[PDB]
């Protein structure tokens, strides 16, 4: 049917397959024009799409040119001097950045959803690497990172990097805006993992506790010692967890600062 | 008539009008499904369009954290071992990458706010405010701003702030790098508005005329004249216009400097 040709084409492009439909330009009916205009429209949308897509994948390669020189450099230090414990942390951060750039590349070219690359993963595997790197950062800023309860072989379903980043942020946010201590508490039950990250520093006014989770938004109070302050962090967190069927809340910490709590459901086979 | 609803909707979205068409969900005909699937498709295409923007703001944000751990690491190598010739290269690459990310974060902060509202707008309404403020800036730096032809009630469809900013930059770049005069020329035809911005100042070598539009690229010649910062300006411009179904080119100005030409299609309906 000519009505069915359009149903099928509109539902196909909606998936993300902006390929031409010659099917809609068949039959000299009143529909030839609705099909030729739809065919024009896919190339029009493709034209608009491959614009953000290219001058993304462009940003990608110019970020790669100084990383490659950094990676080239570290590798030459290793050959001259030894295998310093710090060379390893510089090395692995370059490796960590190299993947995030190839993520800026593959995810631009995809231009679709469901690309969530969701797998089965254990809580202990997921955030161990996170916590270790967080613990290191504390020593460097002379603050105390105490993890009251560690994560265990607790099952989860979703994007590892997405969840990794959710906590990575919560803890760094806690690390930054604290005074001297950060406490991370894992909790597990028949329904889900409950991460609670407490800080030493100043809290956030009860009214602003909801606002923080707004993208590109920072509290007026923290806006007077800003520096490396964007306002992105917690809005990313909120999404990652909410799309992982869980929730995130901001409370008043008994440590005197702010409490962030992430709840995530367990993966049940 | 149900065939005409689709002609009109497909030709409207093709122009960037990703707004919902309730018209296609009228009449309990065989077309209700082709219209409901088309309506689903616009929100699907809008979701894709916005995602590519969110992706960058997120990837740039998360790229900042392993750098910090790099930068933390290098700084600790310096304290343990010496000031290795290679450590300097690793150090300066991290510096360049961080500066890039810092302003890559600034760009996507604006782009999200610029790409907030999509709508029908007249060329005269859009860039008048821009040009007036540009004209004022010229008097203040003792330069001449002459607008050979003003914009008229010419129809356009897209983000006002996105397009506003595209020209705002082209003219300011023209203003900065000029010696004494800046000429802006509007032109309109049955197909589109053609803005041409000419500068008195030094031009750009024919080989570098393509390079300029690269993110972070700032010509070696005009890297000594101004302390600057990014090089994103023209790379942002290129995207804004390219995603607004138009193009941007850099030619040799008859004013002796550089001329930039922005072509944008008219909104028809
Ligand atoms: N642990 C914390 N203690 C106190 N205030 C906090 C804490 N975490 C977040 N905030 C407040 O929430 C605001 C917004 O947080 P958000 O994650 O959205 O952005 P950001 O941390 O400021 O910046 P970035 O995007 O670089 O992470 C901060 O500016 C700060 O005022
Ligand atoms: N009108 C112009 N005349 C001469 N050179 C120009 C002109 N506009 C741009 N350029 C050159 O192209 C480079 C890149 O353009 P771009 O718009 O990114 O400017 P920018 O100053 O580097 O960055 P931004 O405008 O964001 O501050 C400039 O650094 C300069 O060398």
3-state secondary structure of B192: strand
**Set of chain A residues whose Cβ sits within 8 Å of the Cβ of B113:** 216
Segment 161-180 of chain A within 8 Å of chain B by CB: 165, 168, 172
Burial class for B141, CB neighbours closer than 10 Å (0-12, 13-18, 19+): exposed
Which of B40, B93, B235 lies nearest to residue A14, judging by beta carbons?
A: B40
> CA-CA distance, A142 to A145, in Å (whole number)?
10
Q: What is the resolution of this structure in A?
A: 3.4
Contact (CB, 8 A) for B216 and B151: no
Q: What are the beta bridge partners of residue A119?
A: A158
Q: Are residues B67 and B197 in the same domain?
A: no
Q: Tell me the CATH number at B32.
A: 1.10.287.130
Provide the number of structural domains found in chain B.
2
Q: Does B89 touch chain A (CB under 8 A)?
A: yes
> CA-CA distance, A237 to B119, in Å (whole number)?
31
**A61 annotated ligand-binding residue:** yes
Q: Are residues A226 and A127 in the same domain?
A: yes
Contact (CB, 8 A) for B161 and B113: yes
**Phi-psi category of A117—alpha, beta or left, where left has phi over 0 and alpha has psi -120 to 50?**
left
**Looking at residue A108, what DSSP letter applies?**
H
Tell me the residue range of the domain where A206 lies.
116-269
Four-residue CA torsion sign, B220, B224, B230, B236: negative
Q: What are the beta bridge partners of residue B193?
A: B264
- Mutate which: B1, B4, B9, B10, vs A, most A CBs within 10 A: B10
> CA-CA distance, B169 to B130, in Å (whole number)?
10
Protein residues whose CB sits closer than 6 Å to any atom of ligand 2: B 169, 173-174, 177, 199, 201-202, 204, 212, 217-219, 222, 228-234, 257-258
Q: Are residues B96 and B153 in the same domain?
A: no
**A172 annotated ligand-binding residue:** yes
Q: Tell me the CATH number at B172.
A: 3.30.565.10
Q: Which of B115, B145, B173 is the last residue of a domain?
A: B115
Q: Which of B91, B115, B139 is the last residue of a domain?
A: B115
Phi, psi angle pair for A180, to nearest 5° = -145, -20
Cα B50 from chain centroid (whole Å) = 15
* H helix and E strand count, chain A: 7, 7
- Would you state the structure tokens that stand for residue A184, as one six-digit string? 């991370």
Q: Does A188 touch chain B (CB under 8 A)?
A: no
- Would you state the structure tokens that stand for residue B142, as one six-digit string? 């003792």
Q: Does B50 touch chain A (CB under 8 A)?
A: no
Q: Are residues A198 and A153 in the same domain?
A: yes
Q: Which of A115, A145, A175 is the last residue of a domain?
A: A115
> CA-CA distance, B191 to A243, in Å (whole number)?
44
Q: Are residues A126 and A49 in the same domain?
A: no
């Amino acid at each position: 049917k000519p009505a069915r040709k359009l149903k099928n084409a509109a539902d196909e492009v909606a998936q993300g397959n902006l390929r031409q439909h010659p099917e809609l330009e068949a039959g000299p009916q009143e529909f030839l024009a609705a099909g030729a205009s739809f065919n024009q429209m896919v190339t029009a949308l493709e034209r608009m799409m491959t614009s953000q897509q290219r001058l993304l994948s462009d940003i990608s390669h110019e970020l790669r040119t100084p990383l490659t020189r950094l990676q080239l450099g570290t590798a030459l230090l290793r050959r001259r001097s030894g295998e310093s414990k710090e060379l390893e942390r510089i090395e692995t951060e370059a490796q960590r950045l190299d993947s995030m750039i190839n993520d800026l590349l593959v995810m631009s070219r995809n231009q679709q959803k469901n690309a969530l690359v969701s797998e089965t993963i254990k809580a202990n595997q997921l955030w161990s690497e996170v916590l270790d790197n967080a613990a290191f950062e504390a020593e460097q800023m002379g603050k105390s990172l105490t993890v009251n309860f560690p994560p265990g072989p607790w099952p989860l379903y979703g994007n590892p990097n997405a969840l990794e980043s959710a906590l990575e942020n919560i803890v760094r946010n806690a690390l930054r805006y604290s005074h001297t201590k950060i406490e991370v508490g894992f909790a597990v039950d028949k329904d889900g993992i409950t991460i609670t990250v407490d800080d030493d520093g100043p809290g956030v006014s009860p009214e602003d506790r909801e606002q923080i989770f707004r993208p590109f938004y920072r509290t007026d109070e923290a806006r007077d010692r800003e520096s490396g302050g964007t306002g992105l962090g917690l809005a990313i967190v909120e999404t990652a967890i909410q799309q992982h069927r869980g929730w995130v809340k901001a409370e008043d910490s008994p440590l005197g600062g702010l409490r962030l709590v992430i709840w995530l459901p367990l993966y049940k086979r």
